[PDB]
A paper describes a structure:
Hence, this loss of critical proteins has the potential to compromise ER proteostasis and generate cellular stress. This challenge to normal metabolism is overcome by the activity of the cytosolic coatomer protein I (COPI) polymer, whose repeating unit is the coatomer, a 560 kDa complex of seven distinct gene products (α-, β-, β′-, γ-, δ-, ε-, and ζ-COPI)25–31. Overall, the coatomer functions to retrieve the escaped “client” proteins, such as type I membrane proteins, from cis-Golgi back to ER by retrograde trafficking. In particular, the S protein – a type I membrane protein – is delivered to the ERGIC from both the ER (by anterograde trafficking) and the Golgi (by retrograde trafficking)3,10–12. Here we utilize recombinant SARS-CoV-2 S proteins and tail peptides, including constructs with enhanced mimicry of the coatomer binding motif (clientized S protein), to elucidate the atomic structure of the S-coatomer interface.
Biolayer interferometry (BLI) assays showed that Arg13Ala weakened αWD40 binding to both wild-type and clientized Thr1273Glu S heptapeptides, although the affinity for the clientized S heptapeptide was still 2.8-fold higher. F Superposition of wild-type (white) and Arg13Ala mutant (yellow) crystal structures shows minimal perturbation near the mutation site. In contrast, Arg13 and Lys15 residues in αWD40 provide the basis for basal binding to both wild-type and clientized S molecules.
Residue numbers in the entry: 1 to 171, 200 to 331
C-alpha cells in the first residue's frame, strides 16, 4: 500500500488527534500542553486552546455537539465549546495522568482513564462523575465505548484487557465481563471494530492481538507479530479488511484482518509514533509522532 499525505504539521510531539465528523478539521493535543485545531484541506491553524500544564494525551470531538474534551498529565478532563471558544469546565477526580478521553455517541457521557488505575464515566450535562471502574492494578492506558452495546474495553499496564458491562449504569452499575489474558507485558491500547464483534489490543510486548467476542464468551483469534518496540496504538480499518498499528519502532504497520500477515510498513527516520486514528466515514487517517501530525489516505500500491 501507499500513503497519500494530505496534511502535515510540524510541532512539539503530538500525543492525540481527533477528526471532526463533518468538518475537515483535526484537533491535535501536544506534549507542550497545547491543543491545535487545524483545517487539513486548507492547511490553516484555526484555533489554539491553552487549558493544561504538561502533555495532553486525550482529545476527542463530540459527534454532534459543538464540544471537544481533553485529558492531560495534570489529571484534568476539560470540556470545551469550540464555537464560543470557551473552556466550559474541568472534571476533576483523577489522581494521575489522564491517558484517554472520549464522548459517548448517544448518552451524555464522557469516558476517561488514568494512570491512577481507574476508568471514570462522567455526565457532561450534570458535570458529575457517575461511575468509577476499578480492578486494574496498574495504569489504564486506554478505554473505549462499544459502538452498539453497553460495553467498555480497557487496556492496562497490568497486562490485561478488560471488557466491562455497563448495562446497569445505562438503566452493579459496571461489572467486569472479561479479563483478557495473553499479553506478556503492559497493554497500551484497545479498540473495537465499528461493526464486527472484534477487539484489537497492543502493548509493550510488541504484539497486536485480535480478539472476537459474543454476548457470552471471547477468545484470542491471532497475533500480529513484527513490531520491534512498544506498540502505542492500533485500530481497525473501518472500510477495508485491514488492521493498523503504530509503534515506538517508528513504523505504522498495515496487517491483513483475515490472516494477520503484514501488508505494508511505513517508517519515519526519526519519529516514534504515539497515536493513530481514522475518520468515521472517509478513507482518512491521522498519526501523531515525535515531530507533529500527519493526515493521509491509505491506497493500494500503484493506484
Amino acid at each position: 500500500m501507499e500513503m497519500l499525505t494530505k496534511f502535515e504539521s510540524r510541532s512539539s510531539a503530538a500525543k492525540g488527534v481527533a477528526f471532526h465528523p463533518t468538518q475537515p478539521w483535526i484537533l491535535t493535543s501536544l506534549h507542550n500542553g497545547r491543543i491545535q485545531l487545524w483545517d487539513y484541506r486548507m492547511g490553516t491553524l484555526l484555533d489554539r486552546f491553552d487549558g493544561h500544564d504538561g502533555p495532553v494525551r486525550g482529545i476527542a470531538f463530540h459527534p454532534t455537539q459543538p464540544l471537544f474534551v481533553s485529558g492531560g498529565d495534570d489529571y484534568k478532563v476539560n470540556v470545551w465549546n469550540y464555537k464560543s471558544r470557551k473552556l466550559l469546565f474541568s472534571l476533576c477526580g483523577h489522581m494521575d495522568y489522564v491517558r484517554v478521553c472520549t464522548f459517548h455517541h448517544e448518552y451524555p457521557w464522557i469516558l476517561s482513564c488514568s494512570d491512577d488505575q481507574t476508568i471514570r464515566i462522567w455526565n457532561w450535562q450534570s458535570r458529575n462523575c457517575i461511575a468509577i471502574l476499578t480492578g486494574h492494578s496498574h495504569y489504564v492506558m486506554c478505554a473505549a465505548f462499544h459502538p452498539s452495546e453497553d460495553l467498555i474495553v480497557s487496556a492496562s499496564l497490568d497486562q490485561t484487557v478488560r471488557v466491562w458491562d455497563i448495562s446497569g449504569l445505562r438503566m452493579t452499575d459496571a461489572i467486569v465481563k472479561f479479563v483478557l489474558e495473553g499479553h506478556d507485558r503492559g497493554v497500551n491500547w484497545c479498540a473495537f471494530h465499528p461493526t464486527l464483534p472484534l477487539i484489537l489490543s497492543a502493548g509493550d510486548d510488541r504484539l497486536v492481538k485480535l480478539w472476537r467476542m459474543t454476548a457470552s464468551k471471547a477468545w484470542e483469534v491471532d497475533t500480529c507479530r513484527g513490531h520491534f518496540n512498544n506498540v502505542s496504538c492500533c485500530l481497525f480499518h473501518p472500510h477495508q479488511e485491514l488492521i493498523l498499528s503504530a509503534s515506538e519502532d517508528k513504523t505504522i504497520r498495515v496487517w491483513d484482518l483475515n490472516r494477520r500477515t503484514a501488508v505494508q510498513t511505513f517508517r519515519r527516520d526519526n519519529d516514534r509514533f504515539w497515536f493513530i486514528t481514522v475518520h468515521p466515514k472517509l478513507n482518512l487517517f491521522a498519526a501523531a509522532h515525535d515531530s507533529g501530525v500527519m493526515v493521509f489516505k491509505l491506497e493500494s500500491a500503484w493506484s
